[PDB]
């Protein structure tokens, strides 16, 4: 072991569940959720699935300021959508940065891993148990075992669909599981994903104790396509069509989740909005395939750069540009409205 | 929580193999000295070949006995031209779903046997490493590693795991050298990326020799390259590996390859593996320095079956027979020859 | 493992550190009772180190009453005792029987083990933070690391003295430690006990992983002998002359507690005021070995059967009877002008 | 707080040593086979004699495997009147301080390279169960057993723990019948509570074979008894087993006891005497006495590793041991008050 330089001490999952267990109220509103999101998978819940949030929570105050504006657009859209808070903790780049708040929650490159787990399930179980769902990003094999008893859905990592490790990961998840498409558009891995994660299967996993074991699942079948886009947005009713004969020719439910973000904005994160103008035609004229949609949202627009010796912004992403509140808050009245018109 | 987990097992730890299967001096001595020429093939120090051959997947320990004997043989005929080092996967990624590889179900009847798996790997890798023949793997279990990784000389991420993090972190702290698969598209670039990130040091969740997770710093791995293995269609052309190779110099890496034989560069066709030595062979022979390692799907006898079984038979990717292995080595190394 | 009927999964410690951490107080409280005590034992605090309480806790509800009361008498009396809460969650027996809260906390033998653990050091944590440092009995292997870290003393009962891994645990324990001498009266167990755990030690232990390790201790320089009694009761002057020459010839300082409960009251209880008497009189006439004390007392005096199957009285020990509060006020009182008269 | 703790290093589970050192099917066979006399002569439905002999202490396998093949041709000869078993003890329980065994200090320099201990013990554990002799231990820590009671056909509670609650929770879940020691007294009062204490199933925290600690249920182990190893007196006479059989009988338990020649009942050459007056008893008719254990070794005597001199070979280096010659006759003895008592 001459390229493993250090090896140090991480608390169990057992640790963390124990120091910040779900009240009741969070297990029932993690049990509510998954449950909605299963009845809109199986087509027999009309109401859209908006997973929204800031691509990645570096400050727990911000999160629950904004998870209490975001709670109440949801009880006062509920009748047209499933809302639930996207609270991703890092933002997975090849070029160097900041690692996120599990890894580095202190950001300033100290690795407090454990400081990092604390403070993201606390997080988590205030969320929860306010009443507003929470959305989670799948790295690694390891960390869910801390945090995933207080998902209500979650998504691959794009650059991971393929993997088999992270398929087997998903077969055993308790919540619904969305796959990203492929860097150039196509859907073949995603389809393979889903397939995949429906099996059962066998492979080596951390359990809550700290120890590897052997573990098997059921399989998953609450796991979609979420379209992120290729080369060029592909939101677009031509291409929600072609993916549509995609999964039927592949046997699967043709529905999709649009991911208003990233290549499908262009990455500027005010044509979220215009996704929004196109998905809500779609939805309005009729389209049921569109079961969900993923939007980067902050209380503050736009973003920053993490700097040494510097304070930042309050509600501002130091990750990838999110929209801001008010554009947030036209955003859903928008879906809900397109809801509305799809239903009568 | 776990409604989607059925059951949990007991898992033997890495403490457990090794104390069981400790390496003798032979295998350690065999291992140090397979990644040392690696290394000084990739330093640009040794014109030799680094040829990774044999079996898509190990099934049956005693052909793969055989083969290895059979392969050590020629690994030590071909000594001035070739580093040969023998294909002992364990792990194989499906597309969708399958047979994971002989430590996750050994008897391949579905009954997961993964303490089997692990004993029997392990027992077979010391064996091989013993009779004086190194041995390659992928690594695609996160856990697994920690049971084998003392007795491997070289490792692959595959293409479908190229682009995986946690799979460059490991990388990243592997003993030995890593090979990174071009993506399943043909795309270049995940590759460069992955072998300038498991270069870099690392901190990440992974599990000890003692079976307890736990936070582990890597130092990085310099001895990591690039694996043509084709895409839409093969990419082991002279033109492909002029443009790898300014992609590397672009990228600031050596400019450097390993061209995989078999998978979407022969059509998942056996036969095309020839066909690629024949064209490979001839960018060698004139002159080609930027080629410092091939890898062939090859065992006893040729094709492919189903999961009794036929003795000798892949039973995943169609392998060329021993015949046409021990004629490719040949072919192989007198490119090498011509190349000097 | 014939004889091994089941395994059953066991928290770490650091799950229960983890969920109940020390506040600033009970760290303040363990971190000044431990050095008042070391203080004693160097000689240079002439204070008598008093530990009174429950012969066991069985009810965190009458613990944490009672708790009160003798914080009340700690703060009117600490110009001449420490006082020191017995806080016992682990019975020996003399051949079979309830083995206290952590080994059973519902008292039915269904050794929820977890709960008790919980339960224990959430009980503590209570006392501590509440400004009352704790005793407990350290006769577990394993549990130590549950609970040591809220411990300001411990005593090795008097069937364990002789047993080497007692004699390492004390070894390597945060807290002074008293060795009761042997169940039929023998001194020299305890003095042994005493040098075996001053010196360092290597040997197998759990780690607060809850994994087995080696470890190697520093040994423990502040452990003293307690007076218990055996075939007759040795709290006497001419016990407590035996037992300074005795520590004297070994090296010793010569200094005792004396447990005026087990066989120095021939288990009854109401004696233990008679042993009070006495000792009060040596402390009063100038015995300046006298260093500590013990006291089994409780809200209501006497003892009560779980066998019967009748609901319990509160305030009253289902183990070894107890004086009960009034007795107990008296008692502390005397203690408190026999070491003022002992000063003058 | 950990003031007193200096260091933590790594510890193999037992599962490791499990996994290099598998007991055999001969060692497996000799285990079951022993476990299941010593189960039959203390029900009362044999007839022979425990004898548990050999070393006070391991300190060298080789001479350890030699006094074994030794004491193994014995066992077969005397096999009709004795069931043999090896003393397999690693270190002497020591009042304070001092050499601290095979486990803990195999090479003999306080490095306590208690891994290296661990492999080792195992290792001559299960070379002798192979060879086809049972081995007795002595169980003083409650995580050493998990890594050696399966190669263990009989095991002594120290008399400095026969008292204590954990060691009586550990005997309730040993697959091994266990002996109690009197306790110093020369009193048998601890030991019936102890034996009484075992026999009951216990719930408590102990270390799996996975090096975890977990909750542990047992069911109690009937197959527990008397130690007589003396006091300030010896309590081996017909007087003292008279005394130990109305106070096991007055406890409603078995009346039966092993003696133990040496130690306070002891002089190495002394336990020679013992065995005299033991003989005279079974001789005469004394059912009670089930068993006995004898200090014995290659070589008689001991001698000192603090010296800074080479050891001698196959000589104790902790209590005095009588040598190999007095060691077969005292067997043959053995047997041949056992054929008295008989027929
Ligand atoms: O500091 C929180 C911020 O939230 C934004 O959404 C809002 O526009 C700002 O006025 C400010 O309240
Ligand atoms: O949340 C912890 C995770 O952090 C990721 O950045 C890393 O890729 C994983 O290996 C794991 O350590
Ligand atoms: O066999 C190892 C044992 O060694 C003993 O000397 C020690 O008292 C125990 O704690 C245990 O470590
Ligand atoms: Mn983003
Ligand atoms: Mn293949
Ligand atoms: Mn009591
Ligand atoms: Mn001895």
Same mark, same amino acid.
């Given at each position: 072991?001459?390229?493993?330089?250090?090896?140090?001490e991480?608390?169990?999952?057992? +640790? =963390?569940?124990?120091?910040?267990?779900?009240?009741?109220?969070a297990?029932?509103?993690? +049990?509510?959720?998954?449950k909605?999101?299963?009845?809109?998978?199986?087509?027999?819940? /009309?109401? =859209?699935?908006?997973?929204?949030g800031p691509?990645?929570?570096?400050?727990?105050?911000?999160?629950?300021?904004? %998870?209490?504006?975001? @709670?109440? =657009?949801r009880?006062e859209?509920?009748?047209?959508?499933?809302?639930?808070?996207?609270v991703?903790?890092?933002?997975? !780049?090849?070029?160097?940065?900041?690692?996120?708040?599990?890894?580095?929650?202190?950001?300033?490159?100290?690795?407090?891993?454990?400081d990092?787990?604390?403070?993201?399930?606390?997080?988590?179980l205030?969320?929860?148990?306010?009443?507003?769902? &929470?959305?989670g990003?799948?790295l690694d094999?390891?960390?869910?075992?801390?945090?995933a008893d @207080?998902m209500?859905?979650?998504?691959?990592? &794009?650059?991971?669909t393929?993997?088999?490790?992270? !398929?087997?990961?998903?077969?055993?998840?308790?919540?619904?599981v969305?796959?990203?498409?492929?860097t150039?558009?196509?859907?073949?891995? &995603?389809?393979? %994903?889903?397939?995949? +994660?429906?099996?059962?299967?066998?492979?080596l996993?951390?359990?809550?104790?700290?120890?590897?074991?052997?573990?098997?699942?059921?399989?998953?079948? /609450?796991?979609?396509?979420i379209?992120?886009?290729?080369?060029?947005?592909?939101?677009s +009713?031509?291409?929600?069509?072609?993916?549509?004969?995609?999964?039927?020719?592949?046997?699967?439910?043709?529905?999709?989740?649009?991911?208003?973000?990233? %290549?499908?904005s262009?990455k500027?994160?005010?044509?979220?909005?215009?996704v929004? %103008?196109?998905?809500?035609?779609?939805?309005?004229?009729?389209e049921?395939?569109?079961?969900?949609?993923?939007?980067?949202?902050? @209380?503050?627009?736009?973003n920053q750069?993490l700097?040494?010796?510097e304070?930042?912004?309050?509600?501002?992403?130091?990750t /990838?540009?999110?929209?801001?509140?008010?554009?947030?808050?036209?955003? =859903? !009245?928008?879906?809900?409205?397109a809801?509305?018109?799809? !239903?009568?």
């Amino acid at each position: 072991d001459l390229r493993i330089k250090e090896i140090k001490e991480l608390l169990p999952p057992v +640790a =963390l569940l124990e120091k910040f267990p779900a009240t009741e109220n969070a297990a029932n509103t993690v +049990a509510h959720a998954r449950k909605a999101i299963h009845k809109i998978l199986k087509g027999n819940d /009309d109401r =859209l699935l908006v997973v929204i949030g800031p691509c990645s929570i570096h400050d727990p105050v911000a999160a629950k300021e904004y %998870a209490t504006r975001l @709670l109440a =657009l949801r009880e006062e859209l509920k009748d047209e959508l499933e809302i639930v808070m996207r609270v991703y903790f890092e933002k997975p !780049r090849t070029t160097v940065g900041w690692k996120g708040l599990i890894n580095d929650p202190h950001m300033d490159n100290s690795f407090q891993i454990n400081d990092g787990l604390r403070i993201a399930r606390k997080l988590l179980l205030d969320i929860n148990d306010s009443g507003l769902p &929470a959305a989670g990003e799948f790295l690694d094999m390891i960390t869910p075992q801390y945090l995933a008893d @207080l998902m209500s859905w979650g998504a691959i990592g &794009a650059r991971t669909t393929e993997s088999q490790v992270h !398929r087997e990961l998903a077969s055993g998840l308790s919540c619904p599981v969305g796959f990203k498409n492929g860097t150039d558009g196509t859907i073949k891995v &995603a389809i393979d %994903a889903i397939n995949a +994660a429906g099996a059962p299967h066998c492979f080596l996993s951390v359990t809550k104790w700290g120890h590897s074991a052997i573990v098997n699942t059921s399989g998953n079948g /609450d796991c979609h396509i979420i379209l992120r886009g290729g080369k060029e947005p592909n939101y677009s +009713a031509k291409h929600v069509a072609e993916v549509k004969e995609g999964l039927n020719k592949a046997g699967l439910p043709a529905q999709v989740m649009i991911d208003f973000s990233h %290549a499908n904005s262009s990455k500027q994160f005010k044509k979220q909005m215009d996704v929004c %103008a196109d998905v809500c035609q779609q939805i309005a004229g009729g389209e049921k395939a569109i079961i969900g949609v993923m939007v980067e949202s902050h @209380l503050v627009e736009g973003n920053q750069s993490l700097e040494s010796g510097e304070p930042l912004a309050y509600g501002k992403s130091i990750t /990838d540009a999110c929209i801001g509140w008010e554009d947030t808050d036209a955003l =859903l !009245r928008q879906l809900a409205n397109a809801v509305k018109a799809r !239903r009568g």
